[PDB]
Amino acid sequence: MGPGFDFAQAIMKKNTVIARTEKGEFTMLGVYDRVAVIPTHASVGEIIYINDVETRVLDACALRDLTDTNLEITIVKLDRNQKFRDIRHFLPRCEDDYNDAVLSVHTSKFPNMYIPVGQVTNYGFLNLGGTPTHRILMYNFPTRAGQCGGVVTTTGKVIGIHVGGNGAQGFAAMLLHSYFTD
């Protein structure tokens, strides 16, 4: 509808796949080469379904900060025959607050979904499902029964992936450029 939705659509149309684990269907962001991200609560194993195709997982790393605190991001390298468009130059370098963000989801249940979530706070610490978690972004969100990830963008920046909510607020794990240095 406007330039924020334009940037979000451009990311969804080229840099997402539908990932299925034993814990459900998730929006999965492809970042570069065969490397993608997903919430750690997806519990990625040795095999994952990517757009309903059986795919070997070459590597999966549940990220933690240097205090050994959960970040809720898993980085997956997929045994896929095709590379993602490289979007690392759209990743922020530092922890920050944002205005006017969009949360975008693409699953069998929620195809082509875009939500203007407004202001995003650098919230920091969250007890997420009983797990102490750092680097959380927050945006007011009439919390919806179900987590299938999500992509949080502003114009020109891919800033996070949706990992949870409390009924009124939604929460995303930050994406930082430093996670994807090769």
Structural class: mainly beta
Terminus-to-terminus distance: 36 Å
Beta fraction of the residues?
A: over 45%
- Return the domain count: 2
- Can you give the helix content as a percent range? under 10%
Q: Strand order of the main beta sheet, please?
A: 1-2-3-6-5-4
Gross morphology is: globular
Give a quick account of the main beta sheet: strands, pairing sense, barrel closure.
6 strands, antiparallel, barrel
Task: Report the order of strands and helices.
Answer: HEEEEEEEEEEEE
Q: Radius of gyration, rounded?
A: 15 Å
The tally of beta strands, per DSSP, is 12
How many helices? The count is 1
Structure description:
The PDB classes it as viral protein. The entry lists the keywords Diamond I04-1 fragment screening, PanDDA, XChemExplorer, XCE, Viral Protease, 3C, viral protein. The assembly is monomeric. The entry is titled "PanDDA analysis group deposition -- Crystal Structure of Enterovirus D68 3C Protease in complex with Z1201621250". The protein is mainly β and 182 residues long. It has two domains: 1-15 and 85-182, no CATH class; 16-84, no CATH class. 7% of the residues lie in helices and 54% in strands. The chain has one helix at residues 3-15, and strands at residues 16-21, 24-32, 35-39, 47-50, 53-64, 70-78, 98-105, 113-128, 131-140, 151-154, 157-165, 169-174. The strands form two sheets. Strands 1-2-3-6-5-4 form a six-stranded antiparallel β-barrel. Strands 7-8-9-12-11-10 form a six-stranded antiparallel beta barrel. The termini are far apart.
